[PDB]
Design a protein around this ligand. Structure first.
Ligand SMILES: [Zn+2]
Ligand SMILES: [Zn+2]
Ligand SMILES: [Zn+2]
Lengths: 113, 482, 174, 322, 62
C-alpha cells in the first residue's frame, strides 16, 4: 500500500528482501538500484466493512439496526407501556445493566433497571 | 368564524407541526449507535444532537431503515392535530355531516382542505430529496439535498419525506405543488390491474370443481375425491347441498383482491396485494436466499425479575454473526526478522469493550476457525499461529498505548514454498477479516419483535416477545445444534 | 423518452417541462410537454474559441510537465481549450460580455468549485427560458424582445446556469 | 429601490406579451427546421467523400488497356420551390391544395454531379416540406392574400403526408461529448464526434492474463476493440516517465485501496512488454493490437491517433493529460 | 358564433343590445358600467354581454 519513486530513474520500486543480510532493500525495475527502508511498513489501510457500495436506500440491509421495544413495564410519571430496552455502561461498572427509555411522546422518562 | 378564529387555528397548526417534528426527532435516537446517549450520565456532545435540525432531516432521506419509525411517529403525533376539526367549526358544517356519517370521506379528507395536507412519502425515488422549511429561500446548492448530497459520501439513492404546512385553501407553493406531484405519481399508473386478473384466473380451477354432494360432504369433480369430510359451516342449517361452494369461495378471494388498497408502504412492507400473493403462492419455491425462523421465548425465565428482557439479550449476543472487520481499525504488514512478512491488527479498547469481548478471547475464536478451515488458503503448511500483545513497537501509528494488537505469524515451511506479497495480500488478509468471532456463520441478523396475537399460541396470560432469526444443508437441522 | 425513475419528475426541469401535465395509463412519465417559457437552442455558426483568449484565459502547455498550481480547466463544448486564472472574475466577465450582444445568447456557461472546472456549452439540443437580471434592472407598449435582449436587462438562463444563482419567485414582492 | 412596485408588477405582462409575439408558441419546430435545410444538407452531401468502382478481380491492368475508374463529385446543394406539373404549366402549390388532392407536399433537391472515367445538375429526391417555413409558400405574405386557403386558428409545424397531417415529437437521448460515469462496472465512456471513436476506460477485475490467484481491480481501456492496458497507453505517447505520470492523475485523496489497483495496473502492463525501455517499444504493442482485429483501419499507426483518438486537441503530448 | 337572442336561463331578449354595447364600449366606460346603462340588474343576463366571442368578424373574410 506504499510507493516510492526512483532517483534519476523515475519508476515504481519493488519491496524485496535480501537473503543473507537481513535488511529491507527497495529495488526499481529498470535501474536495479538499492535503497534501505526508513519506515519498514509496506501496508497501511483503515479497513472497514465496505459490503454495501451505494446500496443504502436501494437494498433492505441495515448497518445500524433499531432498538427493540417491550410492553411489559409501566413508566413512573407517564404510566404507559411500550418502552425500549438495551444494555450499556454508566460511569464504570463490571458488566452491562438493563436500561429503559419511555418511547411515549411528551413523556421524557428514562430509569435504570 | 369571522375574525381571529382562523388566526388562532393558523397559530395552532404552526405549533402542532413543530412539535410533531420534535416527536419524530426523538424516535431517531433509538439507533444502536446512540446507546451511550440514553444512559443516566452527563455528556459533552449532547448539544450537537439537539441543535442540528437540518442534519436529522437529511438523515431521514438516505439509509431507509430508520425512516419507517419516522413515518409512524408522525402518524401518531398527527392524531392530536386532526382532532382540531371538532373544536373549530359548527356542527351544521356540511363536511362534518358527511364525515361523521361515513358517507363520503373521513376526517383525513377535511384537515387537508382546511388546516394542512400533512406528510408526503413515496415508495422509492432517486437522486433528489425534499428538505425541511420548503420556501423560496431554501433553494441553495450545498445546504439542500435536492442538488448536492453533502460536503465532506455515497448518497445516490434517496427516499423523500416532507411535511407541508399550507392547506388546499390558502394556496400551494410551486415547490409544495411539486412535492404533491412527486408523491402522488404512484397512484396515476394503470399497468397494475392485470395483477388481480392473473391471480384469480389461476386460483379459479383449484376450487371451481369442488361441489357439495348428497352424502353431506364435499367432493372433487375429476376423480370423486374427498377434499374434506365436513364443510366448516358456522350455521347449523344443512341447506348448502348441490351448489359449487368452491366457485363462491374463489370469487370470495377475488373480491378481496380487486378492491385491495394498493397504496404501498415505502420499503419495509411491499403491498397488501403482494403479501396476499406471496401467501397464496405456496409451492412456488423461487429460491433459498433468505429464510426466516421464529424463536419463542417460552421458558422458566418468567419467575425471575425482568426475565424476558434478560433472555432476549443472550440469544441476540450468541446468534448474531459479528465479523472481524467491524472490530479492526488498522492493518499493517510489517517486516520483521518463520516468514518475515507478519501482519498486525490494532484493536481499540472501547470498540472491544462495547461488544462484550476481550483481547485474550479474540484469538481463541480465530484459532478455532483457522484450524477447521485449513483447506481454503494458498499454502496449507505447519506453523500457523496467532499471538497477542499489548503494544505494537513500530513506526506506523504512535497515537497511544490504549490499543491492543495481535501479531499474526503467517504460515511457513522449511522447503520450497511461497511467501510473496501478492499471496499474503489477496487470500490471507480477506480470510481473517471475514472470519466470525461471535455467533454462528450462516445467520444474517436477528430481531426482537412484539406481537399481540402471534401464530402457534401457548394453549395454557399476556402477549409474549420472540426472536426473529434470519438464515441465508438445511434450515432447521442446522440452527438447532449451534 | 424511448426506454426506472423516469416516470417520476425531477427538480432539474424547473420551468422547462410540466410536472403536472402527464397522460395517465402506459405512458405516465415518459411523454412530457414543454412549458410556456420554453425554447430550444441552436448550434452557433461562429467560433467562440478565439474570443475567450482576450478575456483572461491562457493557453495550456504541451510539454507534459509543470502541472497546474490550482488552476481551473475550462471545458469548451466538452473539449479542452486552456486554463483560467480565477473562476470568479473570468466567469463574471464572460457573463457580462454575453449580455452586450457579442457572445451568442444561447450559451450555457456554468462554474463549479466541487469538480474544479468551467463548463461552456454551445451545442444544439438544450432548452432555455428567460430570466430577468437584477444588476441591469436599473435601466427602466415600447418594449420589443430584441431591445430587452441586446441591452442585457433580460437573458436566457440555461439548464446548468440555474444551479449557481438564486431566483426570486415574486418579481415585485420577494 | 427607486422603482415602484406597480411598475415591476406590470413589466412582466409586457415582457411575456413581447415574448409571445417574437418567438410565438412554436419556436422549436421552425428554428430547428430552418437550420436543417440551410446547413444540414450542406454537410450530409459533403462528408461522404467519393465512390470507387473497379471490377478487376483477377489482375490489375489499369495502365494496359485503360481500365475506366468511376469517380463522382458532390456540391452546390439547392432546394427548389414546391411545384407540380399540370397540363404543361407550372402553378403554385399550397398546403390546402395538397390536403384535398391526396398528395404529399414536398420539394425536390438538386446537386452538381460530375463523373470522370478517363485517365450535371442531377436530382436526388424529394423531402417533405413543413408548412409555414422558410421555403414554404405561406411565408412573408399579406393579410389579403392569406385569406384564400388558410385558417386563422392554424399554424405551422406539421408535415403534409398524403394520408393525414403528421407531426414530430422531441425524442430525448443521452448527452454526447461528455464523460459518462457508469456503475457496475465503473466505466467512463466518451461519445463520438466522428462515426466511431469511443473511449471506454474500465476499472474491473483481470480475468484474463492471470495466474488464477491475482484477480483484483485493474485499469483496462476499450479503444477500437484492443483491450490494451492504460499504463502502456501512458508510455505509448507523451510522458515517457512513471514518476511523472502521477501528476496527471493527481487528486490528493486517501490511499486505502486505489493505490493497490494502480500497482496492479502497472504490474499488468509490465508483464506483457517493457514499458519504459525505449520510445519505439511501447508503440509496437498498440501497432500490433490495432492490426489484430476483424476490421482494421489504415495501418499508419503514427497518424491513426490523430483522426481516431481524441478528435480534438491536436498535439500528441497534450492528449495524455485528458 | 353570433350573440344569442335570448338568455340561456332567464329568457330576457338580448339579441338587439349588442351594437349599442360595442357603441358604448368604444368610449372610456368600464365593462361593469356599460351594462348598467342597458338596464340589466341580474348577473344571469350580464355574463352573456360580458363574455361572448365575436366569431363572425373572423368568419366573414372568406
Ligand atoms: Zn532506477
Ligand atoms: Zn500492531
Ligand atoms: Zn339572464
Amino acid at each position: 500500500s506504499t510507493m516510492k519513486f526512483c532517483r534519476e530513474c523515475n519508476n515504481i520500486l519493488y519491496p524485496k528482501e535480501d537473503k543473507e543480510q537481513k535488511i529491507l532493500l527497495y529495488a526499481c525495475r529498470n535501474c536495479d538500484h538499492q535503497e534501505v527502508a526508513d519506515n519498514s511498513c509496506v501496508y497501511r489501510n483503515e479497513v472497514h466493512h465496505s459490503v454495501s457500495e451505494r446500496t443504502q436506500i436501494l437494498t433492505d440491509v441495515a448497518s445500524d439496526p433499531t432498538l427493540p421495544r417491550t410492553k411489559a413495564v409501566r413508566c413512573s410519571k407517564c404510566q404507559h407501556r411500550e418502552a425500549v430496552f438495551f444494555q450499556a455502561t454508566a460511569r464504570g461498572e463490571e458488566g452491562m445493566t438493563l436500561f429503559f427509555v419511555c418511547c411515549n411522546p411528551n413523556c421524557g422518562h428514562r430509569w435504570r433497571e | 368564524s369571522d375574525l381571529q378564529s382562523r388566526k388562532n387555528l393558523t397559530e395552532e397548526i404552526s405549533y402542532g407541526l413543530r412539535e410533531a417534528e420534535q416527536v419524530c426527532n426523538k424516535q431517531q435516537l433509538m439507533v444502536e449507535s446512540w446507546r451511550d446517549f440514553l444512559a443516566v450520565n452527563g455528556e459533552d456532545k449532547e448539544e450537537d444532537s439537539v441543535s442540528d435540525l437540518a442534519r436529522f432531516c437529511y438523515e431521514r432521506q438516505k439509509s431507509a431503515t430508520l425512516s419507517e419509525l419516522a413515518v409512524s411517529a408522525f402518524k401518531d403525533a398527527y392524531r392530536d392535530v386532526q382532532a382540531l376539526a371538532y373544536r373549530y367549526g359548527d356542527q351544521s358544517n356540511s363536511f362534518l355531516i358527511m364525515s361523521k356519517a361515513g358517507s363520503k370521506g373521513n376526517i383525513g379528507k377535511l384537515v387537508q382542505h382546511s388546516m394542512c395536507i400533512g406528510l408526503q412519502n413515496s415508495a422509492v425515488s432517486l437522486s433528489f430529496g425534499f428538505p425541511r422549511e420548503l420556501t423560496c429561500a431554501a433553494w441553495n446548492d450545498p445546504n439542500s439535498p435536492l442538488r448536492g448530497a453533502k460536503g465532506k459520501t455515497t448518497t445516490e439513492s434517496y427516499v423523500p419525506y416532507g411535511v407541508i404546512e399550507n392547506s388546499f385553501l390558502t394556496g400551494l407553493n410551486p415547490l409544495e405543488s411539486f412535492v404533491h406531484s412527486v408523491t402522488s405519481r404512484d397512484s396515476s399508473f394503470s399497468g397494475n390491474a392485470d395483477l388481480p386478473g392473473t391471480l384469480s384466473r389461476r386460483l379459479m380451477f383449484f376450487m371451481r370443481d369442488i361441489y357439495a354432494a348428497y352424502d353431506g360432504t364435499v367432493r372433487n369433480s375429476f376423480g370423486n375425491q374427498l377434499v374434506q369430510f365436513t364443510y366448516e359451516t358456522d350455521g347449523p342449517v344443512e341447506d348448502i347441498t348441490g351448489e359449487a361452494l368452491g366457485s363462491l369461495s374463489a370469487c370470495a378471494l377475488s373480491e378481496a383482491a380487486y378492491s385491495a388498497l394498493d397504496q404501498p408502504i415505502s420499503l419495509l412492507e411491499t403491498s397488501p396485494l403482494l403479501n396476499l400473493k406471496n401467501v397464496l403462492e405456496c409451492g412456488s419455491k423461487k429460491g433459498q436466499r433468505e429464510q426466516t425462523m421464529s424463536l419463542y421465548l417460552s421458558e422458566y425465565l418468567s419467575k425471575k425479575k425482568h426475565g424476558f428482557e434478560y433472555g432476549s439479550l443472550e440469544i441476540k449476543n450468541h446468534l448474531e454473526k459479528l465479523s472481524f472487520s467491524e472490530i479492526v481499525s488498522t492493518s499493517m504488514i510489517i517486516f520483521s526478522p518463520l516468514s518475515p512478512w507478519v501482519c498486525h491488527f490494532h484493536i481499540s479498547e472501547k470498540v472491544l469493550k462495547r461488544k462484550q469481548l476481550s483481547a485474550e478471547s479474540v484469538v481463541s475464536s480465530l484459532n478455532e476457525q483457522y484450524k477447521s478451515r485449513n483447506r481454503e488458503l494458498k499454502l496449507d503448511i505447519v506453523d500457523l499461529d496467532i499471538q497477542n500483545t499489548n503494544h505494537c513497537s513500530s513506526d506506523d501509528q504512535a497515537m497511544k498505548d490504549d490499543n491492543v494488537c495481535i501479531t499474526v505469524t503467517v504460515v511457513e515451511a522449511s522447503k520450497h514454498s511461497v511467501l510473496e506479497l501478492d499471496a499474503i495480500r489477496l487470500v490471507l488478509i480477506p480470510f481473517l477479516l471475514d472470519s466470525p468471532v461471535k455467533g454462528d456463520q450462516g445467520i444474517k441478523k436477528v430481531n426482537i419483535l412484539w406481537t399481540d396475537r402471534p401464530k402457534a399460541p401457548k394453549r395454557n396470560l399476556k402477549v409474549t416477545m420472540y426472536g426473529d432469526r434470519g438464515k441465508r444443508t438445511a434450515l432447521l437441522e442446522t440452527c438447532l445444534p449451534i | 423518452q424511448q426506454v426506472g425513475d423516469a416516470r417520476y419528475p425531477h427538480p432539474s426541469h424547473w420551468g422547462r417541462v410540466c410536472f403536472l401535465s402527464t397522460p395517465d395509463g402506459e405512458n405516465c412519465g415518459l411523454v412530457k410537454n414543454m412549458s410556456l417559457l420554453g425554447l430550444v437552442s441552436t448550434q452557433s455558426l461562429e467560433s467562440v474559441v478565439e474570443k475567450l483568449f482576450a478575456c483572461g484565459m491562457e493557453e495550456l502547455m504541451d510539454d507534459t510537465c509543470t502541472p497546474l498550481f490550482g488552476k481551473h480547466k475550462v471545458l469548451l463544448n466538452g473539449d479542452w481549450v486552456g486554463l483560467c486564472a480565477d473562476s470568479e472574475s473570468f466567469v463574471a466577465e464572460l457573463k457580462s460580455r454575453r449580455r452586450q450582444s457579442e457572445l451568442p445568447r444561447e450559451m450555457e456557461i456554468k462554474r463549479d468549485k466541487d469538480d474544479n472546472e468551467v463548463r461552456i456549452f454551445t451545442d444544439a439540443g438544450r432548452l432555455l427560458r428567460p430570466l430577468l437580471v437584477v444588476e441591469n434592472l436599473q435601466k427602466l407598449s415600447q418594449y420589443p424582445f430584441d431591445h430587452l435582449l441586446d441591452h442585457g436587462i433580460l437573458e436566457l438562463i440555461g439548464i446548468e446556469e440555474e444551479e449557481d444563482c438564486n431566483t426570486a419567485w415574486g418579481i415585485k414582492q420577494l | 429601490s427607486e422603482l415602484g412596485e406597480g411598475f415591476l408588477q406590470s413589466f412582466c405582462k409586457k415582457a411575456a406579451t413581447s415574448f409571445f409575439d417574437k418567438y410565438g408558441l412554436i419556436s422549436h419546430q421552425l428554428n430547428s427546421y430552418n437550420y436543417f435545410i440551410e446547413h444540414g444538407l450542406q454537410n450530409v452531401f459533403q462528408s461522404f467523400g467519393e465512390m470507387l468502382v473497379e471490377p478487376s478481380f483477377d489482375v490489375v491492368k489499369k495502365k494496359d488497356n485503360d481500365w475506366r475508374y468511376a469517380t463522382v463529385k458532390f456540391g452546390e446543394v439547392t432546394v427548389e420551390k414546391p411545384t407540380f406539373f399540370s397540363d404543361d404549366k407550372e402553378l403554385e402549390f399550397l398546403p390546402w391544395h395538397a390536403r384535398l388532392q391526396n398528395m404529399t407536399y414536398s420539394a425536390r433537391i438538386k446537386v452538381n454531379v460530375q463523373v470522370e472515367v478517363f485517365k450535371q445538375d442531377i436530382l436526388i429526391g424529394s423531402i417533405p416540406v413543413m408548412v409555414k417555413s422558410i421555403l414554404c409558400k405561406t411565408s412573408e405574405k399579406g393579410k389579403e392574400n392569406c385569406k384564400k386557403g388558410d385558417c386563422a386558428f392554424d399554424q405551422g409545424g406539421y408535415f403534409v403526408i398524403k394520408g393525414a397531417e403528421k407531426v414530430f415529437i422531441a425524442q430525448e437521448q443521452m448527452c454526447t461529448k461528455r464523460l459518462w460515469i457508469s456503475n457496475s462496472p465503473w466505466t467512463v465512456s466518451f461519445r463520438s464526434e466522428n462515426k466511431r471513436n469511443r473511449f471506454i476506460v474500465r476499472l474491473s477485475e483481470n480475468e484474463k492474463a492471470e495466474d488464477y490467484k491475482r484477480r483484483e481491480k485493474v485499469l483496462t481501456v476499450y479503444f477500437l476493440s484492443t483491450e490494451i492496458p492504460v499504463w502502456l497507453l501512458f508510455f505509448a505517447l507523451g510522458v515517457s516517465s512513471d514518476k511523472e505520470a502521477m501528476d496527471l492523475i493527481a487528486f490528493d485523496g486517501d490511499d486505502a485501496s486505489i493505490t493497490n489497483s494502480l500497482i496492479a495496473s502497472i504490474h499488468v502492463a509490465d508483464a506483457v512488454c517493457e514499458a519504459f525501455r525505449c520510445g519505439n517499444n511501447a508503440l509496437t504493442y498498440v501497432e500490433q493490437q490495432i492490426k489484430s482485429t476483424k476490421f482494421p483501419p489504415a495501418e499508419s499507426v503514427d497518424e491513426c491517433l490523430h483522426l481516431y483518438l481524441f478528435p480534438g486537441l491536436q498535439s500528441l503530448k497534450k492528449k495524455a493529460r485528458f | 358564433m353570433i350573440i344569442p337572442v335570448r338568455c340561456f336561463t332567464c329568457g330576457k331578449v338580448i339579441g338587439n343590445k349588442w351594437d349599442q354595447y360595442l357603441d358604448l364600449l368604444q368610449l372610456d366606460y368600464t365593462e361593469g358600467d356599460a351594462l348598467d346603462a342597458l338596464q340589466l340588474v341580474r348577473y344571469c343576463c350580464r355574463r352573456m354581454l360580458m363574455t361572448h366571442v365575436d366569431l363572425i368578424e373572423k368568419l366573414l373574410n372568406y
